[PDB]
Amino acid sequence: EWLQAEIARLKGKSIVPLQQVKTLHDWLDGKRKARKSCRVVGESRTGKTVACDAYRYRHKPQQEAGRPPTVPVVYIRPHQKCGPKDLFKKITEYLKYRVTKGTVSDFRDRTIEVLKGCGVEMLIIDEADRLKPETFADVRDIAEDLGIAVVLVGTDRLDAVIKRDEQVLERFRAHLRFGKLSGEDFKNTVEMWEQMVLKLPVSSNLKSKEMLRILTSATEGYIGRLDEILREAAIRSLSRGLKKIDKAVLQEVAKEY
Amino acid sequence: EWLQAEIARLKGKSIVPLQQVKTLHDWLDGKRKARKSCRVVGESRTGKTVACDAYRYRHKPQQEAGRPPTVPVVYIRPHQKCGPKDLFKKITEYLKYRVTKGTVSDFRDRTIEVLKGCGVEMLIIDEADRLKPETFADVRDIAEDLGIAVVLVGTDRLDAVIKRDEQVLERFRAHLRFGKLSGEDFKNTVEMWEQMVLKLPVSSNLKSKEMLRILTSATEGYIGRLDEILREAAIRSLSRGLKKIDKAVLQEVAKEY
Amino acid sequence: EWLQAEIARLKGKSIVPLQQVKTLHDWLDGKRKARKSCRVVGESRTGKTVACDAYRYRHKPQQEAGRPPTVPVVYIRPHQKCGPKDLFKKITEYLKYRVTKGTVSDFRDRTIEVLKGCGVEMLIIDEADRLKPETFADVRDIAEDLGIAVVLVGTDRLDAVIKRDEQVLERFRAHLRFGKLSGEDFKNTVEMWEQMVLKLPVSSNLKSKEMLRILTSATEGYIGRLDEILREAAIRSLSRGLKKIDKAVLQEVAKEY
Amino acid sequence: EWLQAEIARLKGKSIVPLQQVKTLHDWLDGKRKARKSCRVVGESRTGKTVACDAYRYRHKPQQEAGRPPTVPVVYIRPHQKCGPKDLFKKITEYLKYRVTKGTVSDFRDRTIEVLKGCGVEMLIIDEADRLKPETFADVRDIAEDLGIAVVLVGTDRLDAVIKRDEQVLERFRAHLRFGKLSGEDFKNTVEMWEQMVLKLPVSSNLKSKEMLRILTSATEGYIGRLDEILREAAIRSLSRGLKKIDKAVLQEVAKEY
DNA sequence: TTAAAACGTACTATATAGACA
DNA sequence: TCTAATATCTACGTTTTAA
């Protein structure tokens, strides 16, 4: 059924080429080329994870005849309170090696071997605040002993964690600030979402003054809020047999925040 | 419906470029250029807040890609009995940073860190008389360690607070006094309100010298009285089916003060 | 461009060798030789901080290869409500050490260890009235257990704090008073500013009675008022296109105080 | 392409004969002659690891007939929370003995066996604060049982760790303080970096008053920051087809710190 | 079986830092 | 005046290994 297909589409996710994504990718290309360790910092739901995820797809593994893959970018998200072994597990699994059970030292040695062997040059650690204090020493050694740019991605909680150890603070001084949407950039973003994400049979004109006021108030400039509001409002409108987001459906969703 | 929209327009606030606002804005430009700390003082409802608010909107943040915003002017109104962590939290949140739970020393260092880098050069503290005596020492250190023109705004209750601390009084001697207004510029201001603010379909002729008399007696030269009387007179007159504000309604309002 | 460069200079700070600075330095040199604790007291904006900075800058940290630096004079300004660890952190970070997380006892032992070996002989605590009552016991123990001249600096607020602990009062009772300027010294100080600080392209003649009499009334002999008035007056005169401070701008500034 | 060769060079590392490196090496020569155990302490990114690693390249293993190679200096960096087995493994592996599986007592006896006969006379343990308090007993026994100068290297955290064991503290009392760069030595280092490290087609004149202020603000005297900033600024400038680091690029890099 | 090495997480003993009366 | 809490700071001992 068309409705079930449209709900299945709007239910999911998609990547939109926002300008802050291009900013990050160009900045990560510099840091990867200079092989330079750094941090990406920005408040929650500003889009940091989707942007870093888009970067590893742009720099997918590359192949040579009869050789292991070169994997320039490794992207991992640690689990909460990540110790050394869980960091080493995360990295080696991303490189597609099922490391046989063993000591932390055995996991460390195998991780160094595959980080060298697969030609990894950038290691993005998303939610780096989830690392234990003892684990940043292993992250620093990967940065120092190998020619690898390590990127710590997090909120202002990461900035607070990093300040607790001079040796991490001084290795990750360079930062990019991921920011909220506002002003005309927000209005351009709303229009892109209508045309590219929602793709409803009839134009909703979300950029118009009253609609834009509702969205500005409810989203507060978070791209996470903008995406979740408009997708649910699109699903509610189509479930009611409407061909567009209507103002009443939008305010009804916006009133839940 | 006509009425509900215009009532909602009159129910909201507006800004008008009065000569007092223009005078303050030039004075603040001099102080910001010189990095001179100073105070703005004057009776309630003389328009100090609206003038200081308009100054930050005229000097809005500049964004550049992947950096924290360049924010030349920060404007804060402290909560009552503001301590130092409250003050630091206000400044960091204005600069679009989330505070992380920590000591006063941690909040201080994070605020000093982002007052740099965001490139702040003026800090306006509206109703500075809400500051605890201990937090004035952090205000003074922001003014002294960084190149920041701190502007204290308040009534004469601010002058009472700062005269009790020698070191605060001497740092904030330079001041501008907001005045109540009467006669010619008052007559112009009344005319400016009926021209630019009330926007009623039919002329109220508040320029009339007898209408100016009753407004002189009630508004007593306070712009915050003048605005509130005319706005209240508009809503009553429109709701009573009148195209106009006239003395029969205007003096019913004016007698209410 | 011309205007921005001279303004960016004039909004800065500069240190003029007043006789008030020399008498402090010759006094602190005698106190340092005797290792004698004492206090410097005087009204706000009399130049106490700038003179103590000048003394600290004449007695530089001396490097010796691979040794910790020999630092004869430490200068600290406590933050407000300075407790023992706050004091110890500021001392040990003035010497080129990081604090490690630890107890008050760990911070004390490390501070006493580095005040020795850095060879400290005078400690200046500027705005010593910010010290908590409890932390004066550690200040007294530094002055008693090591042969260190502790110099407390503040206004009459310091005498109000000190007199409430007779053990502190009786150790820091030797004092020096910073005065208001007056007379021929005030005339001589004004003469220096336009040629040693302002250096506008044309003479301002600030010594002339019609200027000198206004500056007397506006500054009252506070060196901080004298400096900040003339710097702002030069900046405003330049911004109007003038080669010099005119008395019209001098009156335009002096009326703001 | 020439650009890829220069970026590949600038992306790397090099050892500059800084005077503090010479100061350390002269000190380690005295301690190695005396077989005296000691510690090296200084802030993060001050160059301690580069200077220690440079020492064990001067004192590389010997080639000798019919006898195992004399290796005067062993250098190891423990992994985080290094226990004694991991200590012994790193020492034997540095001496190129592939020690098999065994008990800790086997690893101990085999380490003591190869520290003799290789004729080791100095052992440098970098990041010595990573040692468990139980493995410090084996370090002390290496220094006591054999005539070996053990050098413990770390930041101020190492001083705190050593304080917690009387028997370690009294064996490593002698120390060298590795320092930050400042003053004329910083200007000399920026000059040395442009000549010896960046080797760009045209002089960047980074020693100049304008550039030296930008570098001092960003570098704060940390050699680690100096090297990172200048190499990345070079790579940015060459990628833009400049022949040198322009101030516009240097400020653009420095704005990230 | 027999060291003995590696390693998840508990019932505790304190050492503060600071919103309020 | 007097707390919750975010740790520190060892131990609880319990698995895993290989010999």
Ligand SMILES: Nc1ncnc2c1ncn2[C@@H]1O[C@H](COP(=O)(O)OP(=O)(O)OP(=O)(O)O)[C@@H](O)[C@H]1O
């Ligand atoms: N580039 C994008 N294109 C489309 N949707 C996006 C994009 N960036 C963010 N979103 C939407 O915003 C949501 C939140 O983004 P994201 O997961 O990247 O946040 P984050 O900044 O990593 O947050 P947190 O710090 O809380 O983990 C996404 O799940 C998606 O709905």
Ligand SMILES: Nc1ncnc2c1ncn2[C@@H]1O[C@H](COP(=O)(O)OP(=O)(O)OP(=O)(O)O)[C@@H](O)[C@H]1O
């Ligand atoms: N320039 C202006 N343009 C339009 N309305 C104004 C202006 N100045 C004042 N008002 C009106 O007067 C009211 C009071 O002004 P404002 O809030 O600036 O006073 P204030 O001096 O900051 O007062 P207080 O000292 O009591 O806090 C405003 O909320 C608005 O209704």
Ligand SMILES: Nc1ncnc2c1ncn2[C@@H]1O[C@H](COP(=O)(O)OP(=O)(O)OP(=O)(O)O)[C@@H](O)[C@H]1O
């Ligand atoms: N010797 C000097 N040369 C030039 N300017 C000076 C000198 N002394 C004081 N000033 C000016 O006066 C200002 C105030 O001086 P300073 O900070 O030393 O005063 P203070 O007595 O320590 O004040 P407070 O007690 O308020 O902290 C300086 O920032 C500077 O503008």
Ligand SMILES: Nc1ncnc2c1ncn2[C@@H]1O[C@H](COP(=O)(O)OP(=O)(O)OP(=O)(O)O)[C@@H](O)[C@H]1O
């Ligand atoms: N002598 C040198 N010549 C060239 N570059 C140097 C030199 N010393 C330091 N560096 C640069 O500074 C960086 C930091 O130096 P190093 O690793 O030796 O610091 P560290 O003091 O051991 O730091 P930490 O205590 O944080 O581990 C180096 O990786 C290199 O980029």
Ligand SMILES: [Mg+2]
């Ligand atoms: Mg995320």
Ligand SMILES: [Mg+2]
């Ligand atoms: Mg107000």
Ligand SMILES: [Mg+2]
């Ligand atoms: Mg002072």
Ligand SMILES: [Mg+2]
């Ligand atoms: Mg190191």
